[PDB]
Coordinates of N, CA and C in Angstrom, one line a residue:
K1 N 27.8 3.9 -6.2 CA 29.2 4.3 -6.0 C 29.8 3.3 -5.0
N2 N 29.0 2.7 -4.1 CA 29.5 1.7 -3.2 C 28.9 0.3 -3.4
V3 N 27.6 0.2 -3.2 CA 26.9 -1.1 -3.4 C 25.6 -0.8 -4.1
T4 N 25.1 -1.8 -4.8 CA 23.8 -1.7 -5.5 C 22.8 -2.5 -4.8
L5 N 21.5 -2.2 -5.1 CA 20.4 -2.9 -4.5 C 19.1 -2.8 -5.3
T6 N 18.1 -3.5 -5.0 CA 16.8 -3.5 -5.7 C 15.6 -3.5 -4.7
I7 N 14.7 -2.7 -4.9 CA 13.5 -2.6 -4.1 C 12.2 -2.5 -4.9
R8 N 11.3 -3.5 -4.8 CA 10.0 -3.4 -5.5 C 8.9 -2.9 -4.6
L9 N 8.3 -1.8 -5.0 CA 7.2 -1.2 -4.3 C 5.9 -1.6 -4.8
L10 N 5.0 -2.1 -3.9 CA 3.7 -2.5 -4.3 C 2.6 -1.8 -3.6
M11 N 1.7 -1.1 -4.3 CA 0.7 -0.3 -3.6 C -0.6 -0.3 -4.5
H12 N -1.7 0.2 -3.9 CA -3.0 0.3 -4.5 C -3.0 1.5 -5.5
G13 N -3.6 1.3 -6.7 CA -3.7 2.3 -7.7 C -4.0 3.7 -7.2
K14 N -4.8 3.8 -6.1 CA -5.2 5.1 -5.5 C -4.1 5.7 -4.7
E15 N -3.5 4.9 -3.7 CA -2.4 5.4 -2.9 C -1.2 5.7 -3.7
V16 N -0.8 4.8 -4.6 CA 0.3 4.9 -5.4 C 0.1 6.1 -6.3
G17 N -1.1 6.4 -6.7 CA -1.4 7.5 -7.6 C -1.1 8.8 -6.9
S18 N -1.4 8.9 -5.7 CA -1.1 10.1 -4.9 C 0.4 10.3 -4.8
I19 N 1.1 9.2 -4.9 CA 2.6 9.2 -4.8 C 3.2 9.5 -6.2
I20 N 2.5 9.0 -7.2 CA 3.0 9.3 -8.6 C 3.1 10.8 -8.8
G21 N 2.1 11.5 -8.4 CA 2.1 12.9 -8.6 C 1.3 13.3 -9.8
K22 N 0.7 14.5 -9.8 CA 0.0 15.1 -10.9 C 0.8 15.2 -12.1
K23 N 0.2 15.0 -13.3 CA 0.9 15.2 -14.6 C 2.2 14.4 -14.6
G24 N 2.4 13.4 -13.8 CA 3.6 12.6 -13.7 C 4.9 13.4 -13.7
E25 N 4.8 14.7 -13.4 CA 5.9 15.5 -13.3 C 6.7 15.3 -12.0
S26 N 5.9 14.8 -11.0 CA 6.5 14.5 -9.7 C 7.2 13.2 -9.8
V27 N 6.7 12.2 -10.4 CA 7.4 10.9 -10.6 C 8.6 11.1 -11.4
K28 N 8.6 12.1 -12.3 CA 9.8 12.4 -13.1 C 10.8 13.1 -12.2
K29 N 10.3 13.9 -11.3 CA 11.2 14.5 -10.3 C 11.8 13.5 -9.4
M30 N 11.0 12.5 -9.0 CA 11.5 11.5 -8.1 C 12.7 10.8 -8.7
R31 N 12.5 10.3 -9.9 CA 13.6 9.5 -10.6 C 14.9 10.4 -10.7
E32 N 14.7 11.6 -11.2 CA 15.8 12.6 -11.4 C 16.6 12.8 -10.1
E33 N 15.9 12.8 -8.9 CA 16.5 13.0 -7.6 C 17.0 11.7 -7.0
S34 N 16.3 10.6 -7.4 CA 16.7 9.3 -6.9 C 18.0 8.8 -7.5
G35 N 18.1 8.7 -8.8 CA 19.2 8.3 -9.5 C 19.2 6.8 -9.7
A36 N 18.2 6.1 -9.2 CA 18.2 4.6 -9.3 C 17.0 4.2 -10.1
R37 N 17.2 3.4 -11.1 CA 16.2 2.9 -12.1 C 14.8 2.8 -11.4
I38 N 13.9 3.7 -11.8 CA 12.6 3.7 -11.3 C 11.6 3.4 -12.4
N39 N 10.8 2.4 -12.2 CA 9.8 2.0 -13.3 C 8.5 1.6 -12.6
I40 N 7.5 1.3 -13.4 CA 6.2 0.9 -12.9 C 5.7 -0.4 -13.6
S41 N 4.9 -1.2 -13.0 CA 4.4 -2.4 -13.5 C 2.9 -2.6 -13.2
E42 N 2.4 -3.7 -13.6 CA 1.0 -4.0 -13.4 C 0.8 -4.6 -12.0
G43 N -0.4 -5.1 -11.8 CA -0.7 -5.7 -10.4 C -2.2 -6.0 -10.3
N44 N -2.6 -7.2 -10.7 CA -4.0 -7.6 -10.6 C -4.4 -7.4 -9.1
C45 N -3.5 -7.5 -8.2 CA -3.8 -7.4 -6.8 C -3.7 -5.9 -6.3
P46 N -2.5 -5.3 -6.4 CA -2.3 -3.9 -5.9 C -2.6 -2.9 -7.0
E47 N -2.4 -3.3 -8.3 CA -2.7 -2.4 -9.4 C -1.5 -1.6 -9.8
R48 N -0.7 -1.2 -8.9 CA 0.5 -0.4 -9.2 C 1.7 -0.9 -8.4
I49 N 2.8 -1.0 -9.1 CA 4.1 -1.5 -8.6 C 5.3 -0.7 -9.1
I50 N 6.0 0.0 -8.3 CA 7.1 0.8 -8.7 C 8.4 0.0 -8.5
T51 N 9.1 -0.4 -9.6 CA 10.3 -1.2 -9.5 C 11.5 -0.2 -9.5
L52 N 12.2 -0.1 -8.3 CA 13.3 0.7 -8.1 C 14.6 -0.1 -8.1
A53 N 15.7 0.4 -8.7 CA 16.9 -0.3 -8.7 C 18.1 0.7 -8.8
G54 N 19.1 0.5 -7.9 CA 20.2 1.4 -7.8 C 20.9 1.4 -6.5
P55 N 22.1 2.0 -6.5 CA 22.9 2.1 -5.3 C 22.1 2.5 -4.0
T56 N 22.7 2.2 -2.9 CA 22.0 2.5 -1.6 C 21.7 4.0 -1.5
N57 N 22.6 4.8 -2.0 CA 22.4 6.2 -1.9 C 21.2 6.7 -2.7
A58 N 21.1 6.2 -4.0 CA 20.0 6.6 -4.9 C 18.7 6.1 -4.3
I59 N 18.7 4.9 -3.8 CA 17.5 4.3 -3.2 C 17.1 5.1 -1.9
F60 N 18.1 5.5 -1.2 CA 17.9 6.2 0.1 C 17.1 7.5 -0.2
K61 N 17.5 8.2 -1.2 CA 16.8 9.5 -1.6 C 15.4 9.2 -2.1
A62 N 15.3 8.2 -3.0 CA 14.0 7.8 -3.6 C 13.0 7.5 -2.5
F63 N 13.3 6.6 -1.6 CA 12.4 6.2 -0.6 C 12.0 7.4 0.3
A64 N 13.0 8.2 0.6 CA 12.7 9.4 1.4 C 11.8 10.4 0.6
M65 N 11.9 10.4 -0.7 CA 11.1 11.3 -1.5 C 9.7 10.8 -1.6
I66 N 9.5 9.5 -1.9 CA 8.2 8.9 -2.0 C 7.4 9.1 -0.7
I67 N 8.1 8.8 0.4 CA 7.4 8.9 1.7 C 7.0 10.3 2.0
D68 N 7.8 11.3 1.6 CA 7.5 12.7 1.8 C 6.3 13.1 1.0
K69 N 6.2 12.6 -0.2 CA 5.1 12.9 -1.1 C 3.8 12.5 -0.4
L70 N 3.9 11.3 0.3 CA 2.7 10.8 1.0 C 2.4 11.6 2.2
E71 N 3.4 12.2 2.8 CA 3.3 13.0 4.0 C 2.7 14.4 3.7
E72 N 3.1 14.9 2.5 CA 2.6 16.2 2.1 C 1.2 16.1 1.7
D73 N 0.8 15.0 1.1 CA -0.6 14.8 0.6 C -1.5 14.7 1.8
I74 N -1.3 13.8 2.7 CA -2.1 13.7 3.9 C -2.3 15.0 4.7
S75 N -1.2 15.7 4.8 CA -1.2 17.0 5.5 C -1.4 18.2 4.5
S76 N -2.3 17.9 3.5 CA -2.6 19.0 2.5 C -4.0 19.3 2.5
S77 N -4.8 19.0 3.6 CA -6.2 19.3 3.6 C -7.0 18.5 2.6
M78 N -7.2 17.2 2.8 CA -8.0 16.4 1.8 C -9.3 17.0 1.5
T79 N -9.6 17.3 0.3 CA -10.9 17.9 -0.1 C -11.7 16.9 -0.8
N80 N -11.6 15.6 -0.3 CA -12.4 14.5 -0.8 C -12.5 13.4 0.2
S81 N -13.2 12.3 -0.2 CA -13.4 11.2 0.7 C -14.0 11.5 2.0
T82 N -14.5 10.5 2.7 CA -15.1 10.8 4.0 C -14.4 10.0 5.1
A83 N -13.4 10.6 5.8 CA -12.7 9.9 6.9 C -11.9 8.7 6.3
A84 N -10.8 8.4 7.0 CA -10.0 7.3 6.6 C -9.8 6.3 7.7
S85 N -9.7 6.7 8.9 CA -9.6 5.9 10.1 C -8.4 5.0 10.0
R86 N -7.3 5.6 9.4 CA -6.1 4.9 9.2 C -4.9 5.8 9.7
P87 N -4.8 6.0 11.0 CA -3.7 6.8 11.6 C -2.3 6.4 11.1
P88 N -2.0 5.1 11.2 CA -0.7 4.6 10.8 C -0.4 4.7 9.3
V89 N 0.6 4.0 8.8 CA 1.0 4.0 7.4 C 1.4 2.7 7.0
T90 N 0.7 2.1 6.0 CA 1.1 0.7 5.5 C 1.8 0.8 4.2
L91 N 2.8 0.0 4.0 CA 3.5 -0.1 2.7 C 3.8 -1.5 2.4
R92 N 3.2 -2.0 1.3 CA 3.4 -3.4 1.0 C 4.5 -3.5 -0.1
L93 N 5.6 -4.2 0.4 CA 6.7 -4.4 -0.5 C 6.7 -5.8 -1.1
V94 N 7.5 -6.1 -2.1 CA 7.6 -7.4 -2.7 C 8.9 -8.0 -2.6
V95 N 9.0 -9.3 -2.5 CA 10.3 -10.0 -2.4 C 10.1 -11.5 -2.7
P96 N 11.2 -12.1 -3.2 CA 11.2 -13.5 -3.5 C 10.9 -14.5 -2.4
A97 N 10.6 -15.7 -2.6 CA 10.4 -16.7 -1.6 C 11.6 -16.9 -0.7
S98 N 12.7 -16.9 -1.3 CA 14.0 -17.0 -0.5 C 14.2 -15.9 0.4
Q99 N 13.7 -14.7 0.0 CA 13.9 -13.5 0.7 C 13.0 -13.5 2.0
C100 N 11.7 -13.9 1.8 CA 10.7 -14.0 2.8 C 11.1 -15.1 3.8
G101 N 11.5 -16.3 3.3 CA 11.9 -17.4 4.1 C 13.0 -17.0 5.1
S102 N 14.1 -16.5 4.6 CA 15.2 -16.1 5.4 C 14.9 -14.9 6.2
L103 N 14.2 -13.9 5.6 CA 13.8 -12.7 6.4 C 13.0 -13.1 7.7
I104 N 12.4 -14.2 7.7 CA 11.7 -14.7 8.8 C 12.6 -15.4 9.8
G105 N 13.5 -16.2 9.3 CA 14.5 -16.9 10.1 C 13.8 -18.1 10.8
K106 N 14.6 -18.8 11.7 CA 14.1 -19.9 12.4 C 13.0 -19.5 13.4
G107 N 11.9 -20.1 13.3 CA 10.8 -19.8 14.2 C 10.4 -18.4 14.2
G108 N 10.7 -17.7 13.1 CA 10.4 -16.3 12.9 C 11.1 -15.4 14.0
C109 N 12.1 -16.0 14.6 CA 12.8 -15.2 15.6 C 13.4 -13.9 15.1
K110 N 13.8 -13.9 13.8 CA 14.4 -12.8 13.2 C 13.3 -11.7 13.0
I111 N 12.4 -12.0 12.1 CA 11.3 -11.0 11.8 C 10.6 -10.6 13.0
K112 N 10.4 -11.5 14.0 CA 9.7 -11.1 15.2 C 10.4 -10.0 16.0
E113 N 11.7 -10.2 16.2 CA 12.5 -9.2 16.9 C 12.6 -7.9 16.2
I114 N 12.6 -7.9 14.8 CA 12.6 -6.7 14.0 C 11.3 -5.9 14.2
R115 N 10.2 -6.5 13.9 CA 8.9 -5.9 14.1 C 8.6 -5.6 15.5
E116 N 9.1 -6.4 16.4 CA 8.8 -6.2 17.8 C 9.4 -4.9 18.3
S117 N 10.6 -4.6 17.9 CA 11.2 -3.3 18.3 C 10.8 -2.2 17.4
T118 N 10.8 -2.5 16.1 CA 10.4 -1.5 15.1 C 9.1 -0.8 15.5
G119 N 8.3 -1.5 16.3 CA 7.1 -0.9 16.7 C 5.9 -1.1 15.7
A120 N 6.3 -1.6 14.5 CA 5.3 -1.8 13.5 C 5.0 -3.3 13.2
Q121 N 3.9 -3.6 12.6 CA 3.6 -5.0 12.3 C 3.8 -5.3 10.8
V122 N 4.5 -6.4 10.6 CA 4.8 -6.9 9.3 C 3.8 -7.9 8.8
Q123 N 3.4 -7.8 7.5 CA 2.5 -8.7 6.9 C 3.1 -9.6 5.9
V124 N 2.5 -10.8 5.6 CA 3.0 -11.7 4.7 C 1.9 -12.3 3.8
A125 N 2.1 -12.3 2.5 CA 1.1 -12.8 1.5 C 0.9 -14.3 1.7
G126 N -0.2 -14.8 1.2 CA -0.5 -16.2 1.3 C 0.2 -17.1 0.3
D127 N -0.3 -18.2 0.0 CA 0.3 -19.1 -1.0 C -0.5 -20.4 -1.2
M128 N -1.7 -20.2 -1.8 CA -2.6 -21.3 -2.1 C -2.0 -22.3 -3.0
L129 N -1.6 -23.5 -2.5 CA -1.0 -24.5 -3.4 C 0.3 -24.0 -4.0
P130 N 1.1 -24.9 -4.5 CA 2.4 -24.6 -5.2 C 2.2 -23.8 -6.4
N131 N 1.9 -22.5 -6.3 CA 1.7 -21.6 -7.5 C 2.4 -20.3 -7.2
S132 N 2.2 -19.7 -6.1 CA 2.8 -18.4 -5.7 C 4.3 -18.5 -5.7
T133 N 5.0 -17.4 -6.2 CA 6.4 -17.4 -6.3 C 7.0 -16.2 -5.4
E134 N 6.4 -15.1 -5.6 CA 6.8 -13.9 -4.9 C 5.9 -13.6 -3.7
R135 N 6.4 -13.2 -2.6 CA 5.6 -12.9 -1.4 C 5.6 -11.4 -1.1
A136 N 4.4 -10.9 -0.8 CA 4.3 -9.5 -0.5 C 4.1 -9.2 1.0
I137 N 5.0 -8.4 1.6 CA 4.9 -8.1 3.0 C 4.4 -6.7 3.2
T138 N 3.5 -6.5 4.3 CA 2.9 -5.2 4.5 C 3.3 -4.7 5.9
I139 N 4.0 -3.6 6.0 CA 4.4 -3.0 7.2 C 3.6 -1.8 7.6
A140 N 2.9 -1.8 8.7 CA 2.1 -0.7 9.1 C 2.6 -0.1 10.4
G141 N 2.5 1.2 10.6 CA 3.0 1.9 11.8 C 3.3 3.4 11.5
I142 N 4.2 3.9 12.3 CA 4.6 5.3 12.2 C 5.7 5.4 11.1
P143 N 5.7 6.5 10.3 CA 6.6 6.8 9.2 C 8.0 6.5 9.7
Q144 N 8.3 6.8 11.0 CA 9.6 6.6 11.5 C 9.9 5.1 11.7
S145 N 8.8 4.4 12.1 CA 8.8 3.0 12.3 C 9.0 2.2 11.0
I146 N 8.4 2.7 10.0 CA 8.5 2.1 8.7 C 9.9 2.2 8.1
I147 N 10.4 3.4 8.1 CA 11.8 3.7 7.6 C 12.8 2.9 8.4
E148 N 12.5 2.6 9.6 CA 13.4 1.9 10.5 C 13.4 0.4 10.1
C149 N 12.3 -0.1 9.8 CA 12.2 -1.5 9.4 C 12.9 -1.8 8.1
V150 N 12.9 -0.8 7.2 CA 13.5 -0.9 5.9 C 15.0 -0.8 6.0
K151 N 15.5 0.1 6.9 CA 16.9 0.3 7.2 C 17.5 -0.9 7.9
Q152 N 16.7 -1.5 8.8 CA 17.2 -2.7 9.5 C 17.3 -3.9 8.7
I153 N 16.3 -4.1 7.8 CA 16.2 -5.2 6.9 C 17.3 -5.1 5.8
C154 N 17.5 -3.9 5.4 CA 18.5 -3.7 4.3 C 19.9 -4.0 4.8
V155 N 20.3 -3.4 5.9 CA 21.6 -3.6 6.5 C 21.9 -5.0 6.8
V156 N 20.9 -5.7 7.3 CA 21.0 -7.1 7.6 C 21.1 -8.0 6.3
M157 N 20.4 -7.5 5.3 CA 20.4 -8.2 4.0 C 21.8 -8.3 3.4
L158 N 22.5 -7.1 3.4 CA 23.9 -7.1 2.9 C 24.9 -7.8 3.8
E159 N 24.8 -7.5 5.1 CA 25.6 -8.2 6.1 C 25.3 -9.6 6.3
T160 N 24.2 -10.1 5.7 CA 23.8 -11.5 5.8 C 23.8 -11.9 7.2

């Protein structure tokens, strides 16, 4: 209704699976409530990638829904696995080379100040020789810290 955007979610088949939801009825519910083009792709690295596209509002709900699904799962009494030792929450997003380069800014002053206050740590994919095109960033920390990093990067992206 106001402005459109695009966000590529990259996660491990296991983590993303918990987010997908049983019988895919949850992912169906996610889209219906999001309103922004939500799809899935491959990932020799992550295995699962959710391509979301749509106005800031649609995306706002989607991101809030997916994060909640992960919050409900962890706090649902895991009846499997043996300890995780991962108090924080990591989310690896995808972005073009131009996005990562600028997102970092001169001497990383930009990305540094963002993660410095956000309280979370941002990750960056490698680039062995001139082959890689898209860079994957991994933000770990508190759910509040993550949503903050996304809101800060988004607002700055539009306001350039």
